[PDB]
Amino acid sequence: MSLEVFEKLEAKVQQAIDTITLLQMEIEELKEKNNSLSQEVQNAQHQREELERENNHLKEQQNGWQERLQALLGRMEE
Amino acid sequence: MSLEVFEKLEAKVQQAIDTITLLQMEIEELKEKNNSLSQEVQNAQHQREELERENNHLKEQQNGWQERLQALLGRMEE
Numbered sequence: 001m002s003l004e005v006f007e008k009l010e011a012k013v014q015q016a017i018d019t020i021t022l023l024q025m026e027i028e029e030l031k032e033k034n035n036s037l038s039q040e041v042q043n044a045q046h047q048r049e050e051l052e053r054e055n056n057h058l059k060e061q062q063n064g065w066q067e068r069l070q071a072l073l074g075r076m077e078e
Numbered sequence: 079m080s081l082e083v084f085e086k087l088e089a090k091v092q093q094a095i096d097t098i099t100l101l102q103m104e105i106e107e108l109k110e111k112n113n114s115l116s117q118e119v120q121n122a123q124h125q126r127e128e129l130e131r132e133n134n135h136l137k138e139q140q141n142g143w144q145e146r147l148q149a150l151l152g153r154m155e156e
Binding site for chain 1: 084087088090091094095097098101102104105108109111112115116118119122123125126129130132133136137139140143144146147150151153154
């Protein structure tokens with residue numbers, strides 16, 4: 001093996017290795033960009049499930065007044 | 079019923095109504111603020127499920143090179 005065959009090889013080994021790297025970086029970034037979105041889908045869910053609750057508190061309170069308004073009108077019509 | 083009993087009533091009716099209102103508004107805003115968050119939890123999911131796919135494309139392609147490197151080294155050691 002001439003210093004010529006050899007060096008054309010040592011340089012391909014590099015590049016194969018550079019890329020196993022780089023690619024492992026790109027993997028690491030998605031593993032993380034996805035963990036960030038997981039976290040987001042969690043605060044969106046913990047927030048949505050907490051609207052449905054305030055919503056029900058109000059609808060109930062408004063059906064409260066919706067009668068206090070109907071009481072009030074009956075008292076006025078007599 | 080004096081113009082006095084009457085007007086103290088007509089004014090409470092108002093306020094019962096004003097609030098059936100206002101509250102119906104607050105309902106409408108949550109019905110919507112929640113629909114906005116539903117839409118977000120959908121693009122987060124359609125995006126996360128699309129990372130898991132690019133991720134697997136790379137890990138595969140990196141296991142590609144991970145041998146192209148090992149092929150390359152065997153050729154250099156003979």
